[PDB]
Amino acid sequence: TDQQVGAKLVQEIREGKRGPLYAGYFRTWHDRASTGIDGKQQHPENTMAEVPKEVDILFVFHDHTASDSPFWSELKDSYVHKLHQQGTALVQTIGVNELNGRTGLSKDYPDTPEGNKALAAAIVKAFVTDRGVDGLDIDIEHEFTNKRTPEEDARALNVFKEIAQLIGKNGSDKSKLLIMDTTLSVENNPIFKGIAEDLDYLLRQYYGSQGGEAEVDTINSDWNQYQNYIDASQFMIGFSFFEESASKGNLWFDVNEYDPNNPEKGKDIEGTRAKKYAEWQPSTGGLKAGIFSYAIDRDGVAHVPSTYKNRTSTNLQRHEVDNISHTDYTVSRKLKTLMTEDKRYDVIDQKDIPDPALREQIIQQVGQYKGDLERYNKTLVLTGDKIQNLKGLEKLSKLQKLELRQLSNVKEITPELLPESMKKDAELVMVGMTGLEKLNLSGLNRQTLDGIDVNSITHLTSFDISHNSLDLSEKSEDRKLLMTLMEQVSNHQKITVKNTAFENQKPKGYYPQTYDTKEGHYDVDNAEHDILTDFVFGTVTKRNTFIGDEEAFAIYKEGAVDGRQYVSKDYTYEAFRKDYKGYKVHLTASNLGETVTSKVTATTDETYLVDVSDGEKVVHHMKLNIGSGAIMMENLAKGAKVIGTSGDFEQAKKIFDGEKSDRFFTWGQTNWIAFDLGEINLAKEWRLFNAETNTEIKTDSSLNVAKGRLQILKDTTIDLEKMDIKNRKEYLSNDENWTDVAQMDDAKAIFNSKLSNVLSRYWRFCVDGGASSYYPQYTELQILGQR
Ligand SMILES: CC(=O)N[C@@H]1[C@@H](O)[C@H](O[C@@H]2O[C@H](CO[C@H]3O[C@H](CO[C@H]4O[C@H](CO)[C@@H](O)[C@H](O)[C@@H]4O)[C@@H](O)[C@H](O[C@H]4O[C@H](CO)[C@@H](O)[C@H](O)[C@@H]4O)[C@@H]3O)[C@@H](O)[C@H](O[C@H]3O[C@H](CO)[C@@H](O)[C@H](O)[C@@H]3O[C@H]3O[C@H](CO)[C@@H](O)[C@H](O)[C@@H]3O[C@H]3O[C@H](CO)[C@@H](O)[C@H](O)[C@@H]3O)[C@@H]2O)[C@@H](CO)O[C@H]1O
Numbered sequence: 070t071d072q073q074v075g076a077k078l079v080q081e082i083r084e085g086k087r088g089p090l091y092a093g094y095f096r097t098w099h100d101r102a103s104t105g106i107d108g109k110q111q112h113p114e115n116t117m118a119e120v121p122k123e124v125d126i127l128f129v130f131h132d133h134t135a136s137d138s139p140f141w142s143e144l145k146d147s148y149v150h151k152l153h154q155q156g157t158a159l160v161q162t163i164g165v166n167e168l169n170g171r172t173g174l175s176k177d178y179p180d181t182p183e184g185n186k187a188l189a190a191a192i193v194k195a196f197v198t199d200r201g202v203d204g205l206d207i208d209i210e211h212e213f214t215n216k217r218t219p220e221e222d223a224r225a226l227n228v229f230k231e232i233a234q235l236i237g238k239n240g241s242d243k244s245k246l247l248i249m250d251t252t253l254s255v256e257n258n259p260i261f262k263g264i265a266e267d268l269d270y271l272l273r274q275y276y277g278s279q280g281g282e283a284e285v286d287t288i289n290s291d292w293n294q295y296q297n298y299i300d301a302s303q304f305m306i307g308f309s310f311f312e313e314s315a316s317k318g319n320l321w322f323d324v325n326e327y328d329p330n331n332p333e334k335g336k337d338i339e340g341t342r343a344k345k346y347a348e349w350q351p352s353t354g355g356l357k358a359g360i361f362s363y364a365i366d367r368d369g370v371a372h373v374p375s376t377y378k379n380r381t382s383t384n385l386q387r388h389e390v391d392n393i394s395h396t397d398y399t400v401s402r403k404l405k406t407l408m409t410e411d412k413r414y415d416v417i418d419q420k421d422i423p424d425p426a427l428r429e430q431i432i433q434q435v436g437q438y439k440g441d442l443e444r445y446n447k448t449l450v451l452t453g454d455k456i457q458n459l460k461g462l463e464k465l466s467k468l469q470k471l472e473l474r475q476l477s478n479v480k481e482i483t484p485e486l487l488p489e490s491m492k493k494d495a496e497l498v499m500v501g502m503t504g505l506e507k508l509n510l511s512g513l514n515r516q517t518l519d520g521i522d523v524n525s526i527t528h529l530t531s532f533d534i535s536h537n538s539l540d541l542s543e544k545s546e547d548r549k550l551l552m553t554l555m556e557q558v559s560n561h562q563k564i565t566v567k568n569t570a571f572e573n574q575k576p577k578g579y580y581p582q583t584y585d586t587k588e589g590h591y592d593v594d595n596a597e598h599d600i601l602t603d604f605v606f607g608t609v610t611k612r613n614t615f616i617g618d619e620e621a622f623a624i625y626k627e628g629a630v631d632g633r634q635y636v637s638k639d640y641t642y643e644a645f646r647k648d649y650k651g652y653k654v655h656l657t658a659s660n661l662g663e664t665v666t667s668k669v670t671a672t673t674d675e676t677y678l679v680d681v682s683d684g685e686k687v688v689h690h691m692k693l694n695i696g697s698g699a700i701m702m703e704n705l706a707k708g709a710k711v712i713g714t715s716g717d718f719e720q721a722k723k724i725f726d727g728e729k730s731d732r733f734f735t736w737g738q739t740n741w742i743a744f745d746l747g748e749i750n751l752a753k754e755w756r757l758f759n760a761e762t763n764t765e766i767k768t769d770s771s772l773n774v775a776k777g778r779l780q781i782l783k784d785t786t787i788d789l790e791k792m793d794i795k796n797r798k799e800y801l802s803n804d805e806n807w808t809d810v811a812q813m814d815d816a817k818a819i820f821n822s823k824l825s826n827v828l829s830r831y832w833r834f835c836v837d838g839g840a841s842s843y844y845p846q847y848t849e850l851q852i853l854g855q856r
């Protein structure tokens with residue numbers, strides 16, 4: 070049956086039996102059965118029926134072919150049958166706009182769960198079932214003119230997931246392929262992230278150069294992200310043949326340019342980007358699935374010369390290669406046979422992995438091809454007692470986790486049997502290694518012995534963990550695990566330095582995760598002190614063994630097990646210690662005033678709150694006292710409510726929030742705000758954050774308040790509510806009804822000064838002049854004191 074054949078073809082592609090794949094997009098209006106809206110033939114020269122068996126998958130790419138064209142029935146009743154006979158599957162391509170509301174059936178269904186569920190089935194029926202093909206391919210590119218909304222992308226994802234429940238590896242009809250083709254990187258492809266688990270293949274268009282000297286920069290950096298959603302065996306990259314009359318912006322030069330001296334040049338793949346894509350392989354994950362071409366009906370036509378690359382719709386520079394001609398798919402055939410002859414697609418065999426049990430588990434988890442070995446960078450779990458030898462494991466050079474589970478018949482582990490990534494902190498788990506006799510991990514920079522079930526290694530007769538990065542200190546858990554392995558060797562043999570080697574360790578240094586001093590003290594000694602030196606200092610090992618300074622490190626280096634000193638002799642404190650390079654110390658005085666310095670001079674009784682930062686996060690918080698200390702003041706003005714102002718009531722309110730992300734100013738050089746602290750307490754200092762402290766708009770100091778006065782209601786006897794609004798405002802504007810408690814006469818970025826222990830429920834601050842002719846601004850006002 071014609072459905073059964075396609076079903077078996079699709080299953081063999083999805084199971085990976087074709088080796089590397091070659092696919093091509095066939096433009097429907099270049100099939101000789103295609104007819105336009107006027108019912109006339111567009112191009113008699115080519116037909117999908119002549120596409121050769123070297124094309125594993127042929128995509129139907131639609132334009133200009135009219136809905137009533139004979140092409141559709143010719144495709145369904147004729148092309149599909151003949152292409153199936155040779156092993157070629159057919160896939161229909163549609164654009165994302167068919168799914169997001171913008172075109173086709175998408176315009177006839179609501180953006181609702183049941184509407185999108187119904188849209189997906191109508192799409193599958195119209196574009197897959199009714200057309201007679203073997204799968205669906207959704208084309209998702211950047212829309213330059215009219216960007217797609219998040220709701221448009223969210224819907225296409227929902228429809229795509231519903232399609233994935235109808236067809237594909239996770240759909241009820243598994244005889245159809247489900248594919249995406251895209252121009253979008255992971256960070257710009259939210260639909261890909263959501264659908265990637267349901268996709269058979271991802272076809273990444275890479276027409277034209279992709280950056281760097283080998284022209285594949287974007288492919289490598291894209292693959293570094295793509296690999297987290299799909300397998301390398303699902304990744305196809307694409308080049309374009311030369312399309313007739315292509316203009317600036319659609320001129321890729323992926324094939325060889327016209328040669329008036331050689332009409333066959335377009336059929337020569339030497340030197341072409343197409344050949345490079347055939348040969349390119351990802352550097353992690355595995356080998357790719359293959360390559361594809363856009364416009365396979367133009368296979369073999371030489372590219373228009375580089376001199377034409379500036380022609381446009383309105384600036385035509387027609388060339389002989391713009392003519393339509395019959396193709397015999399020579400370039401497609403060459404590219405496919407190049408790939409299938411690539412020996413990196415030879416299957417892993419007895420000579421890579423001698424042990425057949427080891428070989429089987431590797432193949433099941435890393436892939437079937439020799440080229441997968443050195444690329445696979447995930448996790449390998451080896452289990453069972455059938456594995457006797459680990460030779461060849463060293464070939465998974467980028468494995469990031471190796472897990473040896475109950476390998477009762479493995480007698481030997483050596484660096485030469487281990488992936489190179491073991492020298493770079495790859496994870497190493499081994500459990501139930503009851504047959505292991507030699508455990509050699511020397512020279513691997515292992516930072517701990519964690520994951521090694523030393524209790525089960527009941528047969529150990531020698532080990533060498535020397536030249537690692539271990540902490541074998543008294544308290545270190547790796548010293549304890551070492552002793553178990555020395556006990557295991559003892560049960561079989563007299564211990565010698567050689568059969569229990571553990572010397573020349575170089576443990577790496579780390580920042581302590583916390584610091585002990587939560588409340589420091591200095592005497593009033595009139596001297597400078599460094600808060601980093603005294604309170605936030607030192608280095609730890611991976612096992613959290615603290616080393617405060619250089620002589621603590623000199624003490625550490627003499628550490629020994631059974632008289633053997635394990636720290637390498639040439640290992641220096643400066644190689645181990647953390648420099649505190651980016652560290653900044655943030656100080657809040659009892660003032661509430663803030664500074665950034667690690668140095669304090671203990672001249673008078675004071676209290677700081679200390680936040681130490683590493684450049685990105687706070688690593689430690691503590692209190693520092695100098696002499697008797699000093700009680701932290703509160704901003705008594707915080708949240709005070711505004712009672713009157715010559716400016717805007719609502720902008721006046723913002724000088725009492727907590728932030729400097731606002732400004733208060735008026736249409737002039739002077740203004741005032743009167744405010745009510747609500748309560749009554751003792752004010753000892755005041756602080757004004759000037760215009761240049763604005764955090765929401767970079768503000769120059771010419772807008773600073775330069776003169777001003779902070780004042781108190783100088784009555785205390787009156788009721789504000791007794792006045793009504795107009796006179797209230799007028800009273801509060803009258804200079805006679807306030808007395809100065811502080812004067813300001815410098816346009817400092819932050820102005821702070823003391824008050825003779827003022828206490829007044831009611832306040833008013835007056836700007837009297839500015840740094841310049843500009844209207845003076847300030848952002849925040851503080852009144853600082855007790856209770
Ligand atoms: C996998 C891949 O590479 N994908 C793309 C690919 O698009 C691009 O190749 C180009 O594709 C163009 C087709 O895309 C446009 O049209 C489709 C079809 O939509 C119609 O049909 C649907 C079917 O149901 C309808 O539902 C739909 O509503 C339309 O009526 C659109 O789907 C498509 O969508 C766009 O927007 C979405 C938004 O999300 C986006 O995802 C898409 O990527 C796309 O941007 C587009 O609107 C195709 O037209 C291009 O070929 C033309 O230029 C070549 C040279 O550059 C030339 O060789 C070729 O023959 C075409 O030239 C004809 O068409 C021009 C535009 O109509 C005319 O100006 C020309 O004069 C010429 O027409 C003449 O000749 C033909 C016969 O040859 C004749 O029939 C005409 O009457 C006339 O005489 C190009 O192949 C690919 C390569 O760059 O990369 C990826 O972007």
Ligand SMILES: [Ca+2]
Pocket residue numbers: 723724725726727728729730731848849
């Ligand atoms: Ca403010």
